[PDB]
Ligand binder design. Structure first.
Ligand SMILES: N[C@@H](Cc1ccccc1)C(=O)O
Ligand SMILES: [Co+2]
Ligand SMILES: [Co+2]
Length: 277
């Protein structure tokens, strides 16, 4: 049997822009159970993350006044985010067209899936939800270097799309925004949103001998496959957000064409030039 998925169920009776896929955050659809699920997730992650998340992430939660006890009101958070870095968040139904996603980032708008997983799905949801998108991704938007990296990434979508290279950018996003690590004198820390919202990938990614921790290298990353339904086999480690921003400022066009004819690395491979940490 085919049954409707969670995105379809949650969005019953609601609409989205056929173009930019933005809707007003539907506050009246959050049930008491939803605010409780949020509070449970928020509490779980805030217990787990000290000494694991990078300091900028934890300070962003506080500076943005991300609610501990209910799903946040996006308008309220936006007042703080706008004053910090001129960003805002926009509600979307769930996954959106790539060109829309890029155009949002290019214009300093971060798309956030509005709805929340059900309490039976507390431990893990495959689809992004509001907890993953808001709690995992938004705190670092108050950091001006990281926010400029996202805007720059957004602006690159047009060139990538024109050259059939969106998957090569998607790999860079996955291995930075979603699953990145950042080294510090106090030890390795986490900045990827997919780790920061996870029940236990923050533990594996720092504590396990199993994954590879490889120094960031733009061409390697854009030539590396990833999988979405398993802990990462490789994490890429930056030294600073200023590195994402700088390492990723050259013209990507000749890089895409060189990659377009290469065979990519598997998700668990170690490449001959990898600085392995
Ligand atoms: N420098 C990239 C744009 C980009 C910036 C930052 C991250 C990813 C892509 C280009 O030439 O298109
Ligand atoms: Co639709
Ligand atoms: Co994400």
């Amino acid at each position: 049997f085919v049954v409707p998925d969670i995105t379809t169920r949650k969005n019953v009776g609601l609409s989205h822009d056929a173009n930019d896929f933005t809707l007003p955050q539907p506050l009246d659809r959050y049930s008491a159970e939803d605010h409780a699920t949020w509070a449970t997730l928020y509490q779980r992650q805030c217990k787990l993350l000290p000494g694991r998340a990078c300091d900028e992430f934890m300070e962003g939660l506080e500076r943005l006044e991300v609610d501990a006890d209910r799903v946040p009101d996006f308008n309220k958070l936006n007042q703080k985010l706008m004053a910090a870095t001129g960003w805002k968040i926009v509600a979307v139904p769930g996954l959106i067209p790539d060109d829309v996603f890029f155009e949002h980032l290019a214009n300093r708008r971060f798309p956030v899936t509005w709805w929340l997983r059900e309490p039976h799905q507390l431990d893990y949801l495959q689809e992004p939800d509001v907890f993953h998108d808001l709690f995992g991704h938004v705190p670092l938007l108050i950091n001006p270097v990281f926010a400029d990296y996202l805007e720059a990434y957004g602006k690159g979508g047009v060139k990538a799309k024109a050259l059939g290279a969106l998957p090569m950018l998607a790999r860079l996003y996955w291995y930075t925004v979603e699953f990145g690590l950042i080294n510090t004198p106090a030890g390795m820390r986490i900045y990827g949103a997919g780790i920061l919202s996870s029940k236990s990938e923050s533990i594996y990614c720092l504590d396990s001998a199993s994954p590879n921790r490889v120094g960031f290298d733009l061409m390697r990353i854009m030539n590396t496959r990833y999988r979405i339904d398993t802990f990462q086999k490789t994490y890429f480690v930056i030294d600073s957000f200023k590195q994402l921003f700088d390492a990723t400022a050259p013209d990507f066009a000749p890089l895409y064409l060189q990659l377009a004819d290469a065979q990519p690395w598997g998700a668990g491979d170690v490449a001959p030039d990898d600085l392995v940490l």
